[PDB]
Amino acid sequence: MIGVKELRDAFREFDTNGDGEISTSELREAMRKLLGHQVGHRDIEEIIRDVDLNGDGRVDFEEFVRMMSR
C-alpha cells in the first residue's frame, strides 16, 4: 500500500537482466546511465563496495532497501 510498490520498481530497473540480484557488472551498467556516458575513467569498483556492505558480494531485495536508507 504505497511504499513497497515503487520500491520493487527501482529494484527491477537495475536488475533488468534478471537473476533477481545486482552484481558488480550490473549496477555498473546503471551507473553510466545515472551519470551519463563515460568511455574510460574506471572507479566503480568503489561504488560496489558501498552497496556490498553485506559481504555477500551481491545486492538482494532487503539490501536494496537498506542501501536507499541513510
Ligand SMILES: [Ca+2]
Ligand atoms: Ca542481475
Ligand SMILES: [Ca+2]
Ligand atoms: Ca551486500
